[PDB]
């Protein structure tokens, strides 16, 4: 019901609501474009845009059996994904938005009730970037990293265990060895180590220790 589009221009709200009911009536290319655009600019939308993207994807399959919108969306994302490093340089905020959005898409947009394998390596590419020592020193990126691991970390591991394992080695490494990792960064990494080791769930006692 709530797709979280309040950040949008009033005209565009109408465009998006229209696409949900009658995809065929709107420019799905311009619709995917305004969604990716906004997703890189607003944090709440970046973590929630998957809902509306899924609704539209389903609406088009129902109405015309087409997957044009899915296709414009994936290809526009792939382009932002290819330019991830440049975007990170320009704005850490935009970059964490990109990662949150890609990962939200991986969570929401399925393909015959299965995850898109097209996004498995690109998500790991993103999380491995966050696990680097130049990224870990920024609580903003660590926050981003553990958000994705909380939300889709489990699904990701099923697709590829080898990558998850090597990723978490970087997390232990940063944890023990890095010195400009902050207190918050340390609390965030330690919680996620416990979180995975417990089978991607938060224990009652951990809940008490880490969170208000």
């Amino acid at each position: 019901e709530d797709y979280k589009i309040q950040s949008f221009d009033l005209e565009t709200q109408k465009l998006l609501k229209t696409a949900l009911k009658d995809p065929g009536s709107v420019d799905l290319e311009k619709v995917s474009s305004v969604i990716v655009d906004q997703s890189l600019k607003d944090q709440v939308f970046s973590r929630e845009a998957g809902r509306i993207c899924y609704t539209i994807v389903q609406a088009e399959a129902k109405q015309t059996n087409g997957s044009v919108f899915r296709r414009n969306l994936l290809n526009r994302l792939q382009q932002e994904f290819k330019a991830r490093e440049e975007t990170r340089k320009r704005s850490t905020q935009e970059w964490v938005c990109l990662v949150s959005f890609i990962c939200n898409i991986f969570d929401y947009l399925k393909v015959n009730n299965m995850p898109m394998v097209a996004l498995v390596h690109p998500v790991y590419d993103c999380l491995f970037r966050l696990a680097q020592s130049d990224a870990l020193k920024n609580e903003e990126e660590v926050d981003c990293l553990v958000l994705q691991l909380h939300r889709i970390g489990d699904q990701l591991e099923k697709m590829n265990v080898q990558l998850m394992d090597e990723l978490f080695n970087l997390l232990r490494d940063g944890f023990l060895l890095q010195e400009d990792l902050s207190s918050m960064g340390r609390l965030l990494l330690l919680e996620i180590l416990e979180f995975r080791a417990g089978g991607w769930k938060l224990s009652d006692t951990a809940q008490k220790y880490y969170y208000s």
Partner: peptide
């Protein structure tokens, strides 16, 4: 044709390739 840019890695394509393969 093999190696042509139509075959160059494309998320949209990979997903269709998966959807029909499943």
């Amino acid at each position: 044709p093999l190696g042509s840019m139509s075959r160059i890695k494309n998320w949209g394509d990979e997903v269709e390739e998966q959807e029909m393969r499943t």
